[PDB]
Amino acid sequence: NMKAFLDELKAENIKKFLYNFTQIPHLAGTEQNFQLAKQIQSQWKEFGLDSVELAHYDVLLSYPNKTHPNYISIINEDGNEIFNTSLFEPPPPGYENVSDIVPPFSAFSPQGMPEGDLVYVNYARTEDFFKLERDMKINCSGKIVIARYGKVFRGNKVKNAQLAGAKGVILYSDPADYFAPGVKSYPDGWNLPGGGVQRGNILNLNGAGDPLTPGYPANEYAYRRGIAEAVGLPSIPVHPIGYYDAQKLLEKMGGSAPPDSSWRGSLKVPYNVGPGFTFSTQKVKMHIHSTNEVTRIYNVIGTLRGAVEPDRYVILGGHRDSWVFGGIDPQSGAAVVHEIVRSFGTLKKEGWRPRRTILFASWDAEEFGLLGSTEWAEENSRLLQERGVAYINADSSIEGNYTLRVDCTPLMYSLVHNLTKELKSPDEGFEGKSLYESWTKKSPSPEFSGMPRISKLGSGNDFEVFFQRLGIASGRARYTKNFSGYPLYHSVYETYELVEKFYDPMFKYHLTVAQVRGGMVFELANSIVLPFDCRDYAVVLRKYADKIYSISMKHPQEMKTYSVSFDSLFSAVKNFTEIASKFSERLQDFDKSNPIVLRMMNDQLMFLERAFIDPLGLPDRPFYRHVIYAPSSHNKYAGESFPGIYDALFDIESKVDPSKAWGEVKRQIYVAAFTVQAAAETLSEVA
Amino acid sequence: NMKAFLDELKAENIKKFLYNFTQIPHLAGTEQNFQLAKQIQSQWKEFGLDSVELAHYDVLLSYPNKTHPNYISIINEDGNEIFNTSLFEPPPPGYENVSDIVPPFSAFSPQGMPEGDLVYVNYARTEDFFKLERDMKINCSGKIVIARYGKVFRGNKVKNAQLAGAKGVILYSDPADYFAPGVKSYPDGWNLPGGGVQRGNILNLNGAGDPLTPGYPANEYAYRRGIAEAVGLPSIPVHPIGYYDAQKLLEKMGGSAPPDSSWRGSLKVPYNVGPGFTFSTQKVKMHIHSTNEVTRIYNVIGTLRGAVEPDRYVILGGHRDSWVFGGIDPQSGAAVVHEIVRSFGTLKKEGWRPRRTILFASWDAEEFGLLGSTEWAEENSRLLQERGVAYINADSSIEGNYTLRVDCTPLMYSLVHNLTKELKSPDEGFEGKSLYESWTKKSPSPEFSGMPRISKLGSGNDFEVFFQRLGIASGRARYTKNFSGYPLYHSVYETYELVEKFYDPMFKYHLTVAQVRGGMVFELANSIVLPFDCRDYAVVLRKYADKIYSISMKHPQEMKTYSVSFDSLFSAVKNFTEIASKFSERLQDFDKSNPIVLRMMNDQLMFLERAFIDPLGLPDRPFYRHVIYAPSSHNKYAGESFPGIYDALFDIESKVDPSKAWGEVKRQIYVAAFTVQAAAETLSEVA
Ligand SMILES: *[C@@H]1O[C@H](CO)[C@@H](O[C@@H]2O[C@H](CO)[C@@H](O[C@@H]3O[C@H](CO)[C@@H](O)[C@H](O[C@H]4O[C@H](CO)[C@@H](O)[C@H](O)[C@@H]4O)[C@@H]3O)[C@H](O)[C@H]2NC(C)=O)[C@H](O)[C@H]1NC(C)=O
Ligand SMILES: *[C@@H]1O[C@H](CO)[C@@H](O[C@@H]2O[C@H](CO)[C@@H](O[C@@H]3O[C@H](CO)[C@@H](O)[C@H](O[C@H]4O[C@H](CO)[C@@H](O)[C@H](O)[C@@H]4O)[C@@H]3O)[C@H](O)[C@H]2NC(C)=O)[C@H](O)[C@H]1NC(C)=O
Ligand SMILES: *[C@@H]1O[C@H](CO)[C@@H](O[C@@H]2O[C@H](CO)[C@@H](O)[C@H](O)[C@H]2NC(C)=O)[C@H](O)[C@H]1NC(C)=O
Numbered sequence A, B: 001n002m003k004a005f006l007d008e009l010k011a012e013n014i015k016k017f018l019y020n021f022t023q024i025p026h027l028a029g030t031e032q033n034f035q036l037a038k039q040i041q042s043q044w045k046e047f048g049l050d051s052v053e054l055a056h057y058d059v060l061l062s063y064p065n066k067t068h069p070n071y072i073s074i075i076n077e078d079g080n081e082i083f084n085t086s087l088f089e090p091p092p093p094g095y096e097n098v099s100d101i102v103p104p105f106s107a108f109s110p111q112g113m114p115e116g117d118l119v120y121v122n123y124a125r126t127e128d129f130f131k132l133e134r135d136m137k138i139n140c141s142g143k144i145v146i147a148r149y150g151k152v153f154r155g156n157k158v159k160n161a162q163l164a165g166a167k168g169v170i171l172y173s174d175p176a177d178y179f180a181p182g183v184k185s186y187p188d189g190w191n192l193p194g195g196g197v198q199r200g201n202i203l204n205l206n207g208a209g210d211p212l213t214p215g216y217p218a219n220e221y222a223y224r225r226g227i228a229e230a231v232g233l234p235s236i237p238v239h240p241i242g243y244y245d246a247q248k249l250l251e252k253m254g255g256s257a258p259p260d261s262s263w264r265g266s267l268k269v270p271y272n273v274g275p276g277f278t279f280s281t282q283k284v285k286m287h288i289h290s291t292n293e294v295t296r297i298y299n300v301i302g303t304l305r306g307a308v309e310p311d312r313y314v315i316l317g318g319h320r321d322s323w324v325f326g327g328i329d330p331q332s333g334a335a336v337v338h339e340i341v342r343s344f345g346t347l348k349k350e351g352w353r354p355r356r357t358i359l360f361a362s363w364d365a366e367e368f369g370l371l372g373s374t375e376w377a378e379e380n381s382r383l384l385q386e387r388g389v390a391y392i393n394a395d396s397s398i399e400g401n402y403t404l405r406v407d408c409t410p411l412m413y414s415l416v417h418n419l420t421k422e423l424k425s426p427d428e429g430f431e432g433k434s435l436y437e438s439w440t441k442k443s444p445s446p447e448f449s450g451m452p453r454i455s456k457l458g459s460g461n462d463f464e465v466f467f468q469r470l471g472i473a474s475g476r477a478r479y480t481k482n483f484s485g486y487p488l489y490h491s492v493y494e495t496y497e498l499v500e501k502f503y504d505p506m507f508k509y510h511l512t513v514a515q516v517r518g519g520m521v522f523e524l525a526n527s528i529v530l531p532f533d534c535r536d537y538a539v540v541l542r543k544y545a546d547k548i549y550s551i552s553m554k555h556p557q558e559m560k561t562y563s564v565s566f567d568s569l570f571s572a573v574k575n576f577t578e579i580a581s582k583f584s585e586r587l588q589d590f591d592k593s594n595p596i597v598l599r600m601m602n603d604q605l606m607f608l609e610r611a612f613i614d615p616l617g618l619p620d621r622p623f624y625r626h627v628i629y630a631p632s633s634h635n636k637y638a639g640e641s642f643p644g645i646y647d648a649l650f651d652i653e654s655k656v657d658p659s660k661a662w663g664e665v666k667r668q669i670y671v672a673a674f675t676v677q678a679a680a681e682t683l684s685e686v687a
């Protein structure tokens, strides 16, 4: 049973595995990450799984040129380079050995050496550009943009800059966002030093996976697009820097003053918007020589065969590739997965099997655009869509030590509330209290009443293909602090020591998280009726419908003129509530001795998330197919509800042809209404 | 059991129902067809079904203007109309009563009155236009095209004419194609009189359904495209005529002689290609005033709930709407469906239920582009794709009286061979012999060896959405003669008397067909393991792969230059064969006492057709999603195998950018190979 499973999980095994996984860098596509793959594969076998395989793919990756390093320069009239930015981050104490740490770069930047004047765009959010262009009437065309990291996915920033006519992008971490007051810089604290730099890809894939093979696995015989038809590549060069190098670049900024104080970081500089310097005269020059190449990646797939329903899959998955040492990201998740596998393997060895099949994945190349999970899901989509019960993600276990953070489909709200009521809180001052209780006090639902906050699923991690493309119920859970990161995210300072010393000295937060993740998986794979409560969907659908309705009501005149009615959507949401209620009654009232009836009802529960998928996808985003959730078009990290209606409404006042625009709003209402009604009807009696 | 079911079917009930259904016209959208819907609905209830509902939709239909009739004219220099074509067909004896028979028209023609010179284009097939433009260097731009009916779907003809720059199309039936030697014209024989005219729609929908709501049911709150963005509407006017009116128009043809004798019909005319008349001087003028309007349609859906697996659907479906009386098309099918329902209802009343759910449909508006079946499938696609076991079509039972004609998925080859070995042949001179035996002697497989021909499924009937869009295993069966029609197809002369006197005086062919259709449905809904043999798919996949390979090999030089390899496809087809064999062994070797294992294996058998669906669809045809079969792009009535590779190869010598063209061939090989491999893997052990 479950306590057995949970009792078997040890804090000290997790620490042990974390140490093992973080001694050398495990960059996607490198030999070291292949070797770590083989090791996971051997150990998952010893741990007892029925089978363990590697699945490989040849996918587009991106690397700096070793012999021609990227950097930024200030140049004078004579094109002399007065100031150059760092070529690497100062490595942390004890790691001068590090054979090779990849230098900071933006993965997938095109090559180039543009020069021009700087304009400062705050976070380079859509509203930031609105403010700049609309109110301040500044123009970025032909400019080099400098933006700080934070708020939104960096690929969104680069896309907004391209849209604004920019010719290059410089990204940096501002201490306002990455330096927590009263804490010391690494190695004496968990703060980001001025030499530290955030790596990460800057693609706008919208779910496509490998840029060359959208729709299909990048296997041996795959036909590949030419790089010119590749999906999601930026067309301007981009490069990231620390705040020391950034202060040099910002200290001379001329033109307009920040429009207000929210545009201002913590550096001792004016934060002028520019364009140009105060040093007329001087310009900025980028040197990007990174290359894209087709490189092989390896996922590790382990299988624990179910005893009763082997053709039903519960999936625990998390990535193994890291920018450098991956102390937090991803090895604090991977080490938790490893102990969960060891622990399932133990039960199995004593003769136990779960009811359903459990699949365990160690994904590759997440950092480069969720490529390993996606290609694998493109290859197995027929199995996943007919047999996939649920997907639990397992990136970083901790990103703070304050409370539980859970994002999932409403189908799993009750499972997560129940499970956490049986778990001991590991928080100071809640000893003897349940996880549900510390979590509820520290993180109260706005939505009401005496319940914890649970968020929507956006994207930016490996659950994306499972939920947004395939409609498989998905969740994730981690410890967090009281979309920007923790200060040391994706830098060289993310090490084993960072975690042992400052985050989780006892590894008790890792353990709590291993219980939540492992317990969810255990319940999903073994409970006789699937632990999904469809009435939870009925509740949030109503809230989401009120929400998009209020957004539309900011335009009463247009609603009148174009006859924009939400009646069909509320009507669909009403029918969903009613039918969902009745389906629950039947769920309570039928006999579990009849297997066929049990399988039927489970199939209904399983396909219910699947019912929300539109095979045509959302407009311009063919691989985002879920009609209720999609990643925000302004922020890949954030979920948006009724994404098709929301985007039809967004900035509608600016559209040239109002009735065409409002026509499209109404089309999206219709699509949403029909999909909600069709989903509800899957829960009707079947004949 | 099955004999019980079959013994219950009577020839005389079928005749009785056929008579009842053919006394007045039942045009889609008219009150008479609503009334016939209500009657079917009452009678399916009395017959015993658990429930019977009407599902309605508001869809684009098309009608002639009653007070401004369509016709064609010959005009002189002074624009005088010398010759006008008929305004209606002479009604058959006894039907001068007929309140109103719609006059011949091409459904969905735009309005217009173009004048110009005639060019004669034979069947207006793609090769016909190749011959005309390429070899004869004739130019149709600005011309009015005249084509004879036959060979290919009429909508393809109109699209080829548009592509060729034509400004109007005149369609007619040539006695070469619609007058069988030695037989008399109706009412004294089954031949087409010179006054008879073939109705039918001329859309190019490619699976979209209702032109205004592609993707989604045309329900009450549906958002509808503007007619200018409608799917599949021709942009030139089109009108059909009999061979009397056609002889007048053809007798004066000038320009070139027919390129050869295959261009020549049976009329006593030269069959000159034109352009223009021999009467310089005279021109042709079209008068089309037909309108398109959104009109309500009604499907009747009956349900016979399964005893053991109510959430598994076997579907028997056929249309009810007719151009006029529908003596053959569709009421000879509808009357067979009615007797099958009555017969299932009888068993049910004596306490029996099938194992799986059976759904019975009477579709509306088939004649106007398969609209009723399609809209219903767009509305229920989530149920159909997870629960749909099989779809059996039921249009016309007879179109000849020579032998059985069966088209179906390879998954049903064995079911159809077995079932027909248990059925008595109704053919003269095979009394005491089995249906399999007359059918095999009269219609031998080319493919080998001692087996009957079974054809590929294309489109042009209501199975289209189920098979080509949704991937549900589909079949159809009918009596045929020794893509053009029978002579009286879609004319006013298609009556009850036509069938009683000349086709099936005893109704014994209707009865055989009711046994084949009802027996297939019975086996599918009741057999414990689904009666599909996946090794039949392995066999035809190999044949199809040889076939497309030979087509490519006509271009050895390009295959060399571009490195076009079919190795991945043959490799996929090999793995399919191997895995299919092993899956059959397990299928034989497992115990039917374990229900869960039985359901698992049945689910594999059920989803196997589903595995061949690509959610991106085929290029430019988003609603054709099956990778192995699609309707021919040159002939909606015909199936093409590996449609994506075939179309990439078709007329490739003519493409401007060879490596781009050959690139696309290779892409399609890759897609085909991967889909075959993914389908095979669904039949692997599941964990
Ligand atoms: C939520 O579930 C309910 C059912 O429980 C479902 O209600 C349905 O609403 C539709 C659309 O309003 C109803 O449609 C009617 O059908 C009857 C025949 O049964 C027709 O006579 C009506 O048509 C006339 O009136 C229309 C509206 O003014 C005219 O436009 C039309 O031209 C006709 O003159 C009408 O179409 C349907 O009957 C009910 N079904 C019921 C009550 O069982 C509702 O649609 C669901 N919500 C969603 C979004 O699906
Ligand atoms: C039909 O089923 C068979 C399996 O039963 C399946 O065979 C697979 O073929 C692939 C592709 O050829 C094999 O891929 C190899 O994998 C190994 C590692 O296991 C690699 O070392 C190999 O890569 C090297 O060689 C390549 C080819 O020259 C180089 O391009 C590459 O850069 C490497 O140097 C190679 O990728 C795979 O191992 C087998 N699997 C087996 C035999 O189990 C076949 O693909 C199926 N058919 C289809 C169309 O799917
Ligand atoms: C991580 O732990 C693994 C497994 O214990 C270590 O790999 C084993 O170590 C020795 C080499 O000294 C070999 O005898 C085994 O073959 C290895 N087992 C494998 C690959 O599964 C590995 O050395 C550890 N890594 C670190 C950095 O300590």
Ligand SMILES: *[C@@H]1O[C@H](CO)[C@@H](O[C@@H]2O[C@H](CO)[C@@H](O)[C@H](O)[C@H]2NC(C)=O)[C@H](O)[C@H]1NC(C)=O
Residues within 6 Å of the ligand: A073, A081, A082, A083, A084
């Ligand atoms: C920034 O780096 C550049 C590139 O290395 C330095 O300029 C180079 O310096 C060498 C030695 O003076 C010259 O031979 C090259 O011509 C220069 N290269 C280019 C492309 O300008 C420059 O010194 C650095 N700037 C500072 C302030 O250190």
Ligand SMILES: *[C@@H]1O[C@H](CO)[C@@H](O[C@@H]2O[C@H](CO)[C@@H](O)[C@H](O)[C@H]2NC(C)=O)[C@H](O)[C@H]1NC(C)=O
Residues within 6 Å of the ligand: A414, A415, A418, A531, A532, A533, A588
């Ligand atoms: C979470 O736990 C609650 C409370 O135990 C469960 O709700 C009960 O479930 C049982 C078993 O079917 C019913 O008999 C009770 O009537 C339910 N009580 C309530 C308050 O609804 C709920 O099912 C659990 N959710 C899960 C386990 O997914």
Ligand SMILES: *[C@@H]1O[C@H](CO)[C@@H](O[C@@H]2O[C@H](CO)[C@@H](O)[C@H](O)[C@H]2NC(C)=O)[C@H](O)[C@H]1NC(C)=O
Residues within 6 Å of the ligand: B019, B020, B021, B023, B024, B038, B039, B042, B043
């Ligand atoms: C087709 O058969 C039906 C059913 O027997 C006939 O409809 C019935 O006829 C009488 C009207 O004379 C009524 O008492 C019943 O209400 C009808 N039943 C229905 C509608 O289910 C119908 O008249 C026949 N049609 C023809 C042309 O003979």
Ligand SMILES: *[C@@H]1O[C@H](CO)[C@@H](O[C@@H]2O[C@H](CO)[C@@H](O)[C@H](O)[C@H]2NC(C)=O)[C@H](O)[C@H]1NC(C)=O
Residues within 6 Å of the ligand: B073, B081, B082, B083, B084
């Ligand atoms: C073909 O039909 C046209 C249309 O009815 C006939 O021409 C019309 O005839 C009436 C009476 O002569 C005239 O008043 C109209 O002006 C004509 N209409 C048009 C549009 O031309 C014509 O007679 C018919 N041709 C033949 C040979 O019967």
Ligand SMILES: *[C@@H]1O[C@H](CO)[C@@H](O[C@@H]2O[C@H](CO)[C@@H](O)[C@H](O)[C@H]2NC(C)=O)[C@H](O)[C@H]1NC(C)=O
Residues within 6 Å of the ligand: B414, B415, B418, B531, B532, B533, B588
């Ligand atoms: C068609 O009938 C053939 C011959 O009876 C069936 O094949 C046999 O099926 C039985 C039952 O599983 C096996 O034990 C035999 O070994 C099979 N014989 C052969 C020749 O294969 C076949 O299964 C039937 N196809 C159907 C009913 O779908």
Ligand SMILES: *[C@@H]1O[C@H](CO)[C@@H](O)[C@H](O)[C@H]1NC(C)=O
Residues within 6 Å of the ligand: A065, A066, A067, A068, A291
């Ligand atoms: C890296 O830089 C060298 C020159 O310094 C260049 O010639 C080489 O091609 C580069 N490597 C690439 C582009 O992969």
Ligand SMILES: *[C@@H]1O[C@H](CO)[C@@H](O)[C@H](O)[C@H]1NC(C)=O
Residues within 6 Å of the ligand: A139, A140, A141, A142
């Ligand atoms: C922005 O400035 C550039 C300067 O070259 C100009 O080409 C472009 O049209 C301007 N656009 C706006 C938003 O005014």
Ligand SMILES: *[C@@H]1O[C@H](CO)[C@@H](O)[C@H](O)[C@H]1NC(C)=O
Residues within 6 Å of the ligand: A190, A400, A401, A481, A502, A503
């Ligand atoms: C963990 O422990 C305490 C709890 O308040 C906190 O003050 C400290 O900052 C935490 N460590 C990190 C890395 O947040």
Ligand SMILES: *[C@@H]1O[C@H](CO)[C@@H](O)[C@H](O)[C@H]1NC(C)=O
Residues within 6 Å of the ligand: B065, B066, B067, B068, B291
């Ligand atoms: C039919 O023709 C009349 C005139 O004869 C026209 O005015 C009317 O609008 C037409 N009906 C239509 C177009 O539906």
Ligand SMILES: *[C@@H]1O[C@H](CO)[C@@H](O)[C@H](O)[C@H]1NC(C)=O
Residues within 6 Å of the ligand: B139, B140, B141, B142
């Ligand atoms: C066909 O003839 C028309 C005459 O107007 C001309 O415009 C068109 O370019 C010609 N095309 C070909 C195929 O020569």
Ligand SMILES: *[C@@H]1O[C@H](CO)[C@@H](O)[C@H](O)[C@H]1NC(C)=O
Residues within 6 Å of the ligand: B190, B400, B401, B481, B502, B503
């Ligand atoms: C039906 O019966 C005989 C069989 O040869 C045939 O000659 C006759 O033409 C058939 N009727 C039709 C309509 O084909």
Ligand code: MET
Residues within 6 Å of the ligand: A200, A201, A366, A367, A368, A369, A370, A459, A460, A461
């Ligand atoms: C490429 S989607 C997100 C990848 C990675 N988790 C990042 O946030 O940088």
Ligand code: MET
Residues within 6 Å of the ligand: B200, B201, B366, B367, B368, B369, B370, B459, B460, B461
């Ligand atoms: C619109 S697809 C075919 C419709 C009808 N069966 C015809 O052949 O005319």
Ligand SMILES: [Ca+2]
Residues within 6 Å of the ligand: A208, A209, A210, A212, A213, A214, A215, A216, A217, A218, A375, A378
């Ligand atoms: Ca791919």
Ligand SMILES: [Ca+2]
Residues within 6 Å of the ligand: B208, B209, B210, B212, B213, B214, B215, B216, B217, B218, B375, B378
């Ligand atoms: Ca539609």
Ligand SMILES: [Cl-]
Residues within 6 Å of the ligand: A393, A394, A395, A396, A461, A476, A477, A478
């Ligand atoms: Cl996570």
